[PDB]
């Protein structure tokens, strides 16, 4: 009695196809003749759409591969827990969190890398970790290493479970296509049974486990004396003496007398003075409310009892005068093409990751996270880079869909057709706005640079000169500062002190203080706007013009990934959507680099620092952002050269592994230029000569070596370029943040 419909044993389990690489592709099946057959093999592997024309088989492969990635992630998580249980000082750090550096990686002394095992405090030697696992574990009610070990074992078991699930759900019982297309039931289950249920379970964990342990920990109780979490459940009087409302049981819940639970379900806001993190009661009510909302939302779409809206009806009913058919036809697009779903989900997930990175730093949830500047910087930059990559992937796979799965017959005068019919106006207006933003933002920096260089500081765009005050941002900051008073009366303090208010400081360091905005903030925010609009321009031009263009009228027949159309028409290099993605990757890199640089410098200059017992705050870089970040020379001198001392002078210490890596970052970048600046004809001729050489000695290979294809050359260049640049920035940031106390 279900919509379940599966096929039994569609693909037998055998090992023969393991010994025949390239089995999936007919082009690579017959065997290698040149070295290109190798590079194709690793490139067309996980492209199930090209291998077969069956939507059902493609969907089954996707389901199984998703199980595999889940198993891999589970293995990674279990490994993190194991290495934090056995090779970490978490038990030592828990007793003295304000004097001992977190550390979970220990190095074998073999060729002198034992110097990397620097002292992290408390007599423990190891690599300091900035992933923030210790703060998460403390907020999760971890006190003993055995609990972490048990978590790691459970993670390994669950990874094995996911692997077996993939094997069963593909090689044995594979769901039918109609099962995959129950989008209404799928959203119902994932909105209610996954997000709502998961958030409710976490709220239960936090209330019944995390609150008592953290309440004891912040009150000065030793970690070795705090009762085990199950003791609170087995002895409810222990829970009741910590929170009096627990003495009333569950009666106030079912009677809607919810105010009884006000003692441990609060709306405090702000941060915990003891630890610098958010209140756990705030997070408990938050995750409980989130669970309630998602469980309510999960019942919207009708599945099997005719109660609920139908997605197709909603899509077909929203249509206005300017759009003709409106949103009609999108439901068939999104229920028959995986690439459109991948594009939308990638864009939303990348934006969500950027939101996560932007919202964590301003209000640190985990205890002592704000006091650890290195952890803040690392987490912010990491999740920002992840989000940027995901957005670029959305821009790529959308163009893939447009090239492959777009059908003009079923998209007559709908929203997609009117996308393709006024795209030229879109691209022209977007190009104009990109140029205008670039001029009226970067020319401000250049004008300031020239005015400073000419000895005319009074003609600059500075707070002591012509001022560009972000009045709207300051006004919204003032509004959010006044929110606890009347606009949100039941809130004790502000959502985050970044908007304004008091300076929350833990131990001798600043946890969070108001972040004022001046001329420099205005200029940098508009620079961010310019870079983002340019990246959007590149990716949107790639998606819109993927099918064809004025230059090439049958581009879609060439495919998504082709190098060029030849030197005709004056030259047609990089006209495919793939080349648009390749070009947009660089611009995403530039934008995210500027974003992380701005965050790091502003946090170091106007937020982080130390608090004297008198109450005065001494920032890390003495507040030089407002006067130096208005010129490019300021960025060069007071940020790069100034803050690169801690990484260049890292030799002979525990931080030397960063300095090495720093230089490593400066290398691969340069190396990548030897793929991006050149072409494959020269390398092919050089390979011809080298092949003659190896032929003279009768040692020529049977597999004829060939230079990399144009697309592969571009991919290798961009990959090594991004690797080098990102590694450079990572080493620089880590070595700087681990040395500013």
């Amino acid at each position: 009695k279900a919509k379940v419909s599966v096929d039994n044993n569609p693909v037998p389990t055998s090992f023969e196809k393991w010994g025949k690489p390239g089995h999936f592709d007919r082009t690579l099946a017959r065997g290698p003749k040149t070295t290109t057959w190798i590079w194709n093999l690793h490139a067309n592997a996980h492209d199930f759409d090209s291998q077969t024309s069956d939507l059902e088989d493609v969907s089954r492969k996707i389901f199984s591969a998703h199980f595999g990635h889940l198993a891999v992630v589970f293995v990674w998580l279990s490994g993190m827990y194991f290495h934090g249980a056995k090779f970490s000082n978490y038990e030592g750090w828990l007793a003295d969190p304000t004097h001992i550096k977190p550390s979970a990686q220990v190095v074998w002394p073999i060729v002198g890398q034992g110097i990397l095992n620097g002292d992290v405090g408390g007599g423990f030697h190891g690599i300091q970790i900035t992933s923030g696992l210790f703060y998460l574990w403390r907020a999760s009610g971890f006190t003993d290493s055995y609990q972490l070990y048990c978590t790691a074992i459970g993670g390994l078991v669950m990874a094995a479970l996911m692997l077996f699930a993939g094997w069963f759900h593909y090689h044995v019982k594979a769901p039918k296509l109609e099962w995959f297309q129950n989008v209404e039931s799928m959203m119902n289950h994932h909105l209610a049974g996954l997000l709502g249920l998961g958030s409710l379970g976490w709220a239960g964990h936090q209330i019944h486990v995390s609150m008592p342990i953290n309440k004891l920990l912040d009150a000065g109780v030793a970690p070795k004396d705090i009762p085990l979490p199950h003791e609170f459940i087995l002895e409810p009087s222990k829970m009741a003496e910590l929170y009096p409302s627990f003495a009333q049981g569950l009666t106030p819940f079912f009677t809607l007398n919810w105010g009884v639970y006000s003692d441990f379900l609060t709306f405090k806001g702000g941060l915990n003075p003891v630890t610098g993190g958010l209140w756990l009661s705030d997070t408990a009510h938050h995750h409980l409310a989130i669970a309630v909302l998602f469980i309510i939302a999960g019942h919207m779409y009708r599945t099997n009892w005719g109660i609920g809206h139908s997605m197709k009806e909603i899509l077909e009913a929203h249509k206005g005068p300017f759009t003709g058919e409106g949103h009609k036809g999108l439901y068939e697009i999104l229920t028959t093409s995986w690439h459109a779903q991948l594009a939308i989900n990638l864009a939303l997930l990348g934006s969500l990751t950027i939101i996560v990175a932007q919202h964590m730093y301003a209000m640190p949830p985990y205890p002592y996270q704000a006091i650890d500047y290195a952890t803040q910087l690392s987490l912010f930059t990491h999740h920002m880079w992840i989000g940027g990559f995901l957005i670029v992937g959305a821009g790529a796979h959308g163009a893939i869909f447009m090239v492959r799965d777009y059908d003009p017959a079923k998209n007559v005068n709908n929203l997609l057709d009117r996308m393709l019919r006024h795209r030229d106006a879109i691209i022209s207006h977007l190009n104009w706005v990109c140029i205008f933003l670039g001029f009226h933002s970067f020319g401000l920096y250049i004008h300031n640079d020239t005015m400073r260089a000419l000895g005319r500081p009074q003609d600059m765009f500075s707070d002591t000169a012509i001022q560009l005050q972000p009045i709207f941002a300051q006004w919204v900051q003032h509004l959010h500062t006044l929110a606890p008073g009347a606009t949100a009366p039941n809130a004790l303090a502000t959502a985050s002190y970044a908007f304004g208010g008091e300076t929350i400081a833990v131990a001798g360091k600043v946890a969070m203080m108001p972040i004022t905005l001046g001329t420099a903030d205005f200029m940098v925010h508009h620079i961010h706007a310019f870079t983002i609009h340019v990246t959007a321009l590149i990716l949107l031009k790639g998606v819109l013009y993927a099918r064809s263009s004025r230059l090439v009228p049958d581009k879609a027949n060439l495919g998504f990934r082709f190098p060029c159309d030849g030197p005709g028409r004056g030259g047609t290099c990089q006209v495919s959507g793939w080349d648009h993605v390749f070009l947009g990757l660089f611009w995403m890199y530039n934008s995210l680099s500027i974003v992380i640089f701005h965050f790091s410098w502003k946090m170091q200059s106007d937020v982080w620092g130390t608090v004297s017992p008198d109450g005065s705050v001494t920032h890390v870089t003495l507040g030089n952002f407002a006067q130096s970040a208005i010129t490019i020379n300021g960025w060069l001198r007071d940020f790069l050269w100034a803050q690169a001392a801690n990484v260049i002078n890292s030799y002979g210490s525990a931080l030397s592994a960063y300095g090495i890596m720093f230089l490593a970052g400066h290398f691969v970048f340069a190396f990548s230029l030897m793929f991006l600046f050149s072409g494959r004809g020269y390398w092919q001729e050089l390979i011809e000569s080298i092949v003659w050489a190896h032929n003279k000695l009768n040692v020529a290979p049977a597999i004829q070596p060939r230079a990399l294809s144009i697309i592969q050359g571009r991919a290798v260049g961009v990959a090594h370029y991004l690797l080098g640049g990102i590694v450079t920035t990572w080493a620089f940031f880590l070595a700087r943040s681990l040395s500013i106390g």
């Binding site: 049958d554 159309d565 030849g566 030197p567 005709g568 028409r569």
Partner: protein, 80 residues
């Protein structure tokens, strides 16, 4: 405009003719190959130089070559 030249190694496989997107090439009877047909380029003033004809030729090196010369509006593929 560009110059499209066809040499005597052509085998009348018609691949160059089919690959031409601007209809520059054609087939004319011949007697030097089994197919008794050879490629011809009577409308070179429309050729753009995309080299698809060269890409499609199966013979060793090429029986068809495109030399890019004076650029006109048609050759440069301009729609404005």
């Amino acid at each position: 405009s560009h110059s499209v030249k066809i040499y005597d190694t052509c085998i009348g496989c018609t691949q160059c003719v089919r690959a031409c997107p601007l209809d520059v090439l054609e087939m004319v009877p011949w007697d030097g190959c089994k197919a008794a047909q050879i490629a011809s380029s009577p409308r070179t003033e429309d050729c753009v130089g995309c080299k698809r004809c060269e890409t499609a030729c199966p013979t060793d090196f090429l029986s068809i070559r495109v030399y890019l010369g004076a650029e006109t509006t048609r050759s440069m593929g301009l729609a404005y």
